[PDB]
Ligand binder design. Sequence first.
Ligand SMILES: CCCCCCCCCCCC
Ligand SMILES: CCCCCCCCCCCC
Lengths: 119, 49, 116, 91, 49, 49, 59
Amino acid sequence: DFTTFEGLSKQSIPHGMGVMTFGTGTGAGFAMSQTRYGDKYEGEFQAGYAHGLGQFTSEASGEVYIGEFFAGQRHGCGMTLDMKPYFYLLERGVDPVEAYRRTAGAIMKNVEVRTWYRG
Amino acid sequence: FKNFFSFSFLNNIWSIPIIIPDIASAMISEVSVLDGYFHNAFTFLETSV
Amino acid sequence: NVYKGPASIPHASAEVFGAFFLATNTALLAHMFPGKLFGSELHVRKWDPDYLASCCNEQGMRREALSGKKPNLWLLGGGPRLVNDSWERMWWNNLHWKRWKVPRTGPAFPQDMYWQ
Amino acid sequence: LSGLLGDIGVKCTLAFAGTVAAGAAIVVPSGKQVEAASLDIYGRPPSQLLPNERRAAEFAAGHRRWKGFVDNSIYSWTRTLPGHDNPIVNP
Amino acid sequence: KPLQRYIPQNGGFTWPGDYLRLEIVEMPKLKSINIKKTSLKQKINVQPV
Amino acid sequence: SSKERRMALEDLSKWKIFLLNFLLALTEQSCIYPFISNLSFGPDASILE
Amino acid sequence: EMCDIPEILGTVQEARQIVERARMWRFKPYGEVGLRMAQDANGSPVSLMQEPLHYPHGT
Ligand SMILES: CCCCCCCCCCCC
Ligand SMILES: CCCCCCCCCCCC
């Protein structure tokens, strides 16, 4: 399904640290509806699950999550950003400096800090 | 045998052009602006001496 | 004095067999111990094919760019196949060449010495 | 030279070449791809077809020719004689 | 028992897109015409869906 | 070499001697003492750069 | 028990370290992902500068 994984592995299962890019479908214990084509998870893996500390990035939607994961779901402290306007301006031919200058304040104001329990 | 005899193997392709994608089509998630003045899209003019 | 067969049919000497035997044994011994062959080792090749291809591509692209034309990259194995199903099939030749990187370069026998 | 024909390898190579030549004579189509195969299997002119589709059309035409030959020439001759008691494996 | 290892492997006997469609699997085929008394020579095993 | 053919050298023999080494220079041959035949008096990894 | 602001800040600070350390397994020189997912604008494969001995184009 073009889902790719690069990182440490025990036996044949992802184990340790690594980066996983999602294609069609899902992986690393994530729900089928959470991911899209091109999203990535970087951080700790354990028994094929995104378990530990990590960061989830979605280029299509702009959501960025940094923090704790248990099993395959968010569980612990986390920080959420919505960089959608920056990507929107970047994809429309605007140089990164100008897009950052335009959309830094709104993104900084909407930074969220949260505690998650079983997703 | 027809390909071997007709000299049609001289039309084989071995080379392709390389085109650099712009920042719009690149990994925009990797591009980040530092201090509001620089970014990570590195492009230097090959070798200048 | 003995017949030893007709002279029309070629005969192989014993020196060639002795040389073959000693050469095989010495090749195995030299492969086993990399650092003992007069302080040096035994190499199958001089330059890796990928290194030569990269150098040649670099020089060719430099020459083409300086001449005022868009450079081209020559692929080891062959070019693309005009197909509309899957990306792997389109670039099967270059992928086939690149997938043999480890077996082509590295030796099959263990690199170091064990039990001694 | 009869000396070449004396060797077994030359005879085997000649037999293989003759078999290949006969097969190509009896199965290679000509003008039946666009007429029958291409329009039937893709409904498009052979020129507009992808390179991997033209080969499929040619293979279909050749297979049709092979079946026609094996039915109209060999099987009619060998089946004019009816079932001659049809020996079967006893054990 | 020897442990199974889940490593994706590269194409063989077919292009990566498809699978072996014409593989022969031993399962009886049923004729639409009713057969009053004729053993299938191979039981269909688990009958219900 | 094993058959030990010895005779006065003609032009054809000399050209055979030339051609043997000329063709052998285009293949991968066993090399003793590496890391010394690959040295170069310059800021490079070999002499081909 | 809900995390407070210092705990969340420390968790993010450590998570960034973890992500940076994990991003070092991302572009294995000769691997399937690197060979099949590193493409130029037209989608053709590119020769990534990851040779152990060759540093071309004044790099
Ligand atoms: C092995 C079959 C192809 C060999 C071709 C060698 C020379 C290619 C020259 C191409 C010029 C356009
Ligand atoms: C050497 C064995 C094959 C030689 C004959 C080739 C048969 C196909 C020829 C087709 C010509 C139109």
